[PDB]
Design an enzyme around this catalytic site. Structure first.
Site, short mmCIF file in Angstrom:
data_model
loop_
_atom_site.label_atom_id
_atom_site.label_comp_id
_atom_site.label_asym_id
_atom_site.label_seq_id
_atom_site.Cartn_x
_atom_site.Cartn_y
_atom_site.Cartn_z
N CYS A 12 0.86 -1.18 0.00
CA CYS A 12 0.00 0.00 0.00
C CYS A 12 0.89 1.23 0.00
O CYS A 12 2.12 1.12 0.07
CB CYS A 12 -0.88 0.02 1.25
SG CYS A 12 0.03 0.31 2.79
N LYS A 46 4.46 -5.58 3.32
CA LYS A 46 4.39 -6.48 4.47
C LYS A 46 4.58 -7.92 4.00
O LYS A 46 3.87 -8.38 3.12
CB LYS A 46 3.02 -6.34 5.15
CG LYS A 46 2.76 -7.30 6.30
CD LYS A 46 1.36 -7.10 6.87
CE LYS A 46 1.05 -8.12 7.96
NZ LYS A 46 -0.36 -8.00 8.44
N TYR A 62 5.62 -3.78 10.86
CA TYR A 62 4.37 -3.39 10.22
C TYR A 62 3.34 -3.17 11.32
O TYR A 62 2.19 -2.84 11.05
CB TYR A 62 3.89 -4.45 9.23
CG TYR A 62 3.19 -3.85 8.04
CD1 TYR A 62 3.88 -3.62 6.85
CD2 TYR A 62 1.87 -3.42 8.12
CE1 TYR A 62 3.27 -2.98 5.77
CE2 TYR A 62 1.25 -2.78 7.06
CZ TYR A 62 1.95 -2.56 5.89
OH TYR A 62 1.35 -1.89 4.85
N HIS A 74 1.88 -5.28 13.08
CA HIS A 74 0.86 -6.31 13.13
C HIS A 74 1.33 -7.56 13.87
O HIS A 74 0.92 -8.67 13.54
CB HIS A 74 0.40 -6.66 11.72
CG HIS A 74 -0.23 -5.52 10.99
ND1 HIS A 74 -0.66 -5.61 9.68
CD2 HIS A 74 -0.51 -4.25 11.38
CE1 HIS A 74 -1.16 -4.45 9.30
NE2 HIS A 74 -1.09 -3.61 10.31
N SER A 134 -3.83 -8.69 5.21
CA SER A 134 -2.86 -7.60 5.11
C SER A 134 -2.98 -6.69 6.33
O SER A 134 -1.99 -6.12 6.80
CB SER A 134 -3.11 -6.79 3.83
OG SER A 134 -4.40 -6.19 3.84
N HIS A 135 -4.20 -6.59 6.85
CA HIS A 135 -4.50 -5.77 8.02
C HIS A 135 -5.41 -6.63 8.89
O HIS A 135 -6.53 -6.96 8.51
CB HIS A 135 -5.16 -4.47 7.57
CG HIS A 135 -4.24 -3.62 6.74
ND1 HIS A 135 -3.97 -3.90 5.42
CD2 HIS A 135 -3.47 -2.56 7.07
CE1 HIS A 135 -3.07 -3.04 4.97
NE2 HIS A 135 -2.75 -2.22 5.95
C1 LIG Z 1 0.70 2.09 14.71
C2 LIG Z 1 -0.18 0.91 14.35
C3 LIG Z 1 -0.97 0.97 13.21
C4 LIG Z 1 -1.83 -0.13 12.84
N1 LIG Z 1 -2.63 0.03 11.72
C5 LIG Z 1 -3.49 -0.99 11.40
C6 LIG Z 1 -4.43 -0.83 10.30
O1 LIG Z 1 -4.51 0.18 9.63
N2 LIG Z 1 -5.29 -1.90 10.03
C7 LIG Z 1 -5.25 -3.11 10.79
O2 LIG Z 1 -6.02 -3.97 10.47
N3 LIG Z 1 -4.43 -3.24 11.83
C8 LIG Z 1 -3.55 -2.25 12.18
N4 LIG Z 1 -2.75 -2.39 13.27
C9 LIG Z 1 -2.78 -3.64 14.07
C10 LIG Z 1 -4.07 -3.78 14.91
O3 LIG Z 1 -4.48 -2.48 15.34
C11 LIG Z 1 -3.74 -4.69 16.09
O4 LIG Z 1 -3.28 -5.95 15.57
C12 LIG Z 1 -4.98 -4.93 16.94
O5 LIG Z 1 -5.55 -3.70 17.37
C13 LIG Z 1 -4.58 -5.79 18.11
O6 LIG Z 1 -5.85 -6.15 18.94
P1 LIG Z 1 -5.73 -6.80 20.31
O7 LIG Z 1 -7.14 -6.90 20.85
O8 LIG Z 1 -4.97 -7.97 20.28
O9 LIG Z 1 -4.94 -5.91 21.18
P2 LIG Z 1 -5.10 -4.38 21.73
O10 LIG Z 1 -6.14 -3.64 20.97
O11 LIG Z 1 -3.90 -3.75 21.93
O12 LIG Z 1 -5.79 -4.44 23.08
C14 LIG Z 1 -5.18 -4.88 24.36
C15 LIG Z 1 -5.64 -3.99 25.35
O13 LIG Z 1 -5.18 -4.51 26.68
C16 LIG Z 1 -4.76 -3.36 27.49
N5 LIG Z 1 -3.92 -3.99 28.51
C17 LIG Z 1 -2.70 -4.62 28.32
N6 LIG Z 1 -2.19 -5.11 29.45
C18 LIG Z 1 -3.11 -4.79 30.41
C19 LIG Z 1 -3.14 -5.05 31.87
N7 LIG Z 1 -2.21 -5.69 32.50
N8 LIG Z 1 -4.26 -4.56 32.53
C20 LIG Z 1 -5.27 -3.88 31.88
N9 LIG Z 1 -5.32 -3.60 30.55
C21 LIG Z 1 -4.22 -4.08 29.86
C22 LIG Z 1 -4.10 -2.45 26.51
O14 LIG Z 1 -3.94 -1.14 27.01
C23 LIG Z 1 -5.08 -2.51 25.29
O15 LIG Z 1 -6.11 -1.56 25.31
C24 LIG Z 1 -1.84 -1.32 13.68
C25 LIG Z 1 -1.04 -1.38 14.86
C26 LIG Z 1 -0.21 -0.29 15.21
C27 LIG Z 1 0.61 -0.41 16.47
O1 LIG Z 2 -0.66 -0.49 6.06
C1 LIG Z 2 -0.92 0.66 6.41
C2 LIG Z 2 0.18 1.66 6.68
C3 LIG Z 2 -0.15 2.98 7.08
C4 LIG Z 2 0.88 3.93 7.33
C5 LIG Z 2 2.25 3.56 7.18
C6 LIG Z 2 2.58 2.23 6.78
C7 LIG Z 2 1.55 1.28 6.53
#
Ligand SMILES: Cc1cc2nc3c(=O)[nH]c(=O)nc-3n(C[C@H](O)[C@H](O)[C@H](O)COP(=O)(O)OP(=O)(O)OC[C@H]3O[C@@H](n4cnc5c(N)ncnc54)[C@H](O)[C@@H]3O)c2cc1C
Ligand SMILES: O=Cc1ccccc1
Ligand SMILES: *[C@@H]1O[C@H](CO)[C@@H](O[C@@H]2O[C@H](CO)[C@@H](O[C@H]3O[C@H](CO)[C@@H](O)[C@H](O)[C@@H]3O)[C@H](O)[C@H]2NC(C)=O)[C@H](O)[C@H]1NC(C)=O
Ligand SMILES: *[C@@H]1O[C@H](CO)[C@@H](O[C@@H]2O[C@H](CO)[C@@H](O)[C@H](O)[C@H]2NC(C)=O)[C@H](O[C@@H]2O[C@@H](C)[C@@H](O)[C@@H](O)[C@@H]2O)[C@H]1NC(C)=O
Ligand SMILES: *[C@@H]1O[C@H](CO)[C@@H](O)[C@H](O)[C@H]1NC(C)=O
Ligand SMILES: N#C[C@H](O)c1ccccc1
Ligand SMILES: N#C[C@H](O)c1ccccc1
Length: 521
Positions: free
Chosen positions: A328, A361, A457, A459, A496-497
């Site tokens: 992308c 990615k 990435y 992810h 991919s996401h």
């Molecule tokens: C900068 C960035 C950009 C991204 N962009 C994309 C995108 O465009 N599209 C896409 O599909 N994916 C994207 N991702 C990946 C995607 O957002 C994550 O894979 C996904 O949100 C992970 O979900 P999760 O429920 O596993 O974890 P999380 O959403 O992180 O949730 C875990 C939660 O647990 C909380 N927590 C942790 N430990 C504790 C504790 N001990 N006590 C209480 N609370 C706690 C944390 O604060 C958090 O809120 C991105 C990730 C990043 C970092």
């Molecule tokens: O895949 C989405 C993305 C967004 C900003 C920077 C790099 C990757």
């Protein structure tokens, strides 16, 4: 899909600061981590039972810039004071990274790209998927926080480049992860308002769901009634006062603390490698050799071009999907303050003009590492994590193919207008950072490029895999009333996401639990 609207904060009616929650509470379900999977899971369970979600971070309202698309880079640029929504960390590999620390989890600070999981991955995943339920759940999520994006000039240019470069076929607008080029959905609506997992809390029952923020869960409590069972958790508030939340008969503690947070909490709670826990004097509740193992982070390799003529910032919507790598292009304004995690190190040149970031990615990835504690007692001290980028040569081969494809994009008629000089091949662009090898057939040069310019990435996933730590129902084997539901349960990325799949997963398991309670009722 949903229709553009303000971020829905109706759930605030049942959101409390940990300092205001009871010192000792009783519920049917306690969810650790109000994140991407955690929120929809909690909302679903609340349809029938009393649920308490405990989140260490703040409400999204405490950090307004997490609510708009033009605040994406801002959040990453913000200094980490231990309370901000973007927590910074560096893998042992030396690659900068970030994870969410706010209600809504990482879905509150991400790039908004939404995609459904590759439909071919469910089969031999270790889970007997109810595909009718899977799709009903995707629809449930999509009708609440996923939108068909506005057309955007740079994304359109990128689309033309992908099609010229053979990333076929064209899928038009589609949410499905399929080989080819397409415009997918986004959690950012048409006005740029960010929608996220926290809004899925609004789908729950306001009389059964309670959310606690600024709640640091430090340990899972166990007992033998009569067999080893999770009975609740201990969490601490901003005043340093510890509280206890217990679950009642047939109830369960579900950990949705993320790829990093879940293995950390399990280890701190005595569930993990016996020799490891003992070495740190952590009482062993149950020897579980794979807790914290199989941590994967898909590598991101890229090329930054600085067009001679300014381009407008955009949200990623156009995806160029290949079997071995996903691509992308992100266009953005210049920065003088580095967005942590965007580039692999703090010592990376900053763009003083608008630029385009072509990202690639690698699928999988096959390479993996592990997570270990940095503190044997403080859950607020980030764990150590190593991903071993490119340790598996198949990943490297895929990076090479991927960057060659980026080279193709750079050589298209579509990108010619963005070169500074009319030079042959991939030459002629004003590059920010490490450029591609000029010779597109020099594999060895591409391998070096892949290794030396790698970034995350973001992810990352794994660390508490189904078939290793969990069973097909996401239960931690050997322990009753304890499950794990978040990005830590599978070895490879679902698309991919991944947010689409993790969002769906939360409600999916929630529904499976309700169906289970119905049969045993
Ligand atoms: C900068 C960035 C950009 C991204 N962009 C994309 C995108 O465009 N599209 C896409 O599909 N994916 C994207 N991702 C990946 C995607 O957002 C994550 O894979 C996904 O949100 C992970 O979900 P999760 O429920 O596993 O974890 P999380 O959403 O992180 O949730 C875990 C939660 O647990 C909380 N927590 C942790 N430990 C504790 C504790 N001990 N006590 C209480 N609370 C706690 C944390 O604060 C958090 O809120 C991105 C990730 C990043 C970092
Ligand atoms: O895949 C989405 C993305 C967004 C900003 C920077 C790099 C990757
Ligand atoms: C669960 O949802 C899946 C999509 O996320 C769905 O797969 C999709 O099913 C449609 C038909 O319902 C297929 O048809 C579309 O594409 C074909 C080929 O391009 C066209 O000929 C059709 O006109 C239509 O546009 C999709 O190809 C298919 N997509 C994918 C990626 O598989 C599953 O069937 C759903 N599962 C259940 C049990 O409901
Ligand atoms: C890189 O990932 C590959 C896919 O996971 C590994 O190959 C697979 O290894 C399995 C053993 O764990 C084996 O059952 C599979 O058949 C095999 N699949 C393939 C694509 O060959 C690979 O592991 C190495 O190569 C395989 C063939 C075996 O010889 C292993 O013993 C090797 O370690 C991974 N390479 C690395 C660096 O681990
Ligand atoms: C979809 O997943 C299957 C099974 O893991 C894999 O073989 C295929 O390459 C994937 N397709 C894409 C485009 O990622
Ligand atoms: N392809 C295609 C459609 O025109 C489209 C769909 C969503 C956003 C922009 C454009
Ligand atoms: N292939 C593959 C991944 O491990 C995967 C991810 C989510 C669900 C099933 C499987």
């Amino acid at each position: 899909l949903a229709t553009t609207s303000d971020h829905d904060f109706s759930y605030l009616s049942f959101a409390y600061d940990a300092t205001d929650l009871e010192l000792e509470g009783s519920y049917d379900y306690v969810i650790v981590g109000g994140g991407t999977s955690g929120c929809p899971l909690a909302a679903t369970l609340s349809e029938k039972y009393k649920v308490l979600v405990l989140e260490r971070g703040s409400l999204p309202t405490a950090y307004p810039n997490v609510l708009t698309a033009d605040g994406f880079v801002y959040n990453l640029q913000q200094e980490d004071d231990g309370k901000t929504p973007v927590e910074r960390f560096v893998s042992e590999d030396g690659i900068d990274n970030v994870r969410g620390r706010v209600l809504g989890g990482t879905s509150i600070i991400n790039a908004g790209v939404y995609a459904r999981a590759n439909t071919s991955i469910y089969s031999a995943s270790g889970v007997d998927w109810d595909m009718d339920l899977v799709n009903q759940t995707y629809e449930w999520v999509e009708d609440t926080i996923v939108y068909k994006p506005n057309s955007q000039s740079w994304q359109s240019v990128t689309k033309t480049a992908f099609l010229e470069a053979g990333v076929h076929p064209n899928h038009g607008f589609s949410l499905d992860h399929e080989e080819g080029t397409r415009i997918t959905g986004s959690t950012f609506d048409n006005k740029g308002t960010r929608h996220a997992a926290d809004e899925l809390l609004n789908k729950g029952n306001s009389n059964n769901l309670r959310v606690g923020v600024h709640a640091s869960v430090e340990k899972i409590i166990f007992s033998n009634a009569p067999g080893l069972t999770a009975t609740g958790v201990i969490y601490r508030d901003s005043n340093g006062t510890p509280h206890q939340a217990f679950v009642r008969s047939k109830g369960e503690v579900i950990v949705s603390a993320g790829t990093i947070g879940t293995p950390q909490l399990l280890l701190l709670s005595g569930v993990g490698p016996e020799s490891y826990l003992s070495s740190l004097n952590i009482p062993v509740v149950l020897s579980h050799p794979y807790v914290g193992q199989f941590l994967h982070d898909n590598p991101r390799n890229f090329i930054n071009i600085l067009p001679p003529n300014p381009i407008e910032p955009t949200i990623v919507t156009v995806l160029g999907i290949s079997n071995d790598f996903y691509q992308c292009s992100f266009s953005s304004l210049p920065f003088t303050t580095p967005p942590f995690g965007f580039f692999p190190s703090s010592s990376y040149p900053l763009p003083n003009s608008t630029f385009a970031h072509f990202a690639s990615k690698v699928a999988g990835p096959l390479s993996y590492g592990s997570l270990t504690l940095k503190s044997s007692s403080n859950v607020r001290v980030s764990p150590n994590v190593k991903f071993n980028y490119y340790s598996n040569l198949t990943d490297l081969s895929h990076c090479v193919s991927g960057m060659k494809k980026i080279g193709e994009l750079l050589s298209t008629d579509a990108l010619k207008p963005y070169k500074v000089e009319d030079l042959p091949g991939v030459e002629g662009f004003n590059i920010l950072g490490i450029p591609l090898p000029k010779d597109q057939t020099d594999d060895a040069a591409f391998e070096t490029f892949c290794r030396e310019s790698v970034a995350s990435y973001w992810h990352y996933h794994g660390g508490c895999l189904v078939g290793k730590v969990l069973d097909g129902d996401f239960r931690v084997t050997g322990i009753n009333a304890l499950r794990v539901v978040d990005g830590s349960t599978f070895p490879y990325t679902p698309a991919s996401h991944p947010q689409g799949f993790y969002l769906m997963l939360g409600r999916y398991v929630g529904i499976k639990i309700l169906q289970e309670r119905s049969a045993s009722d």
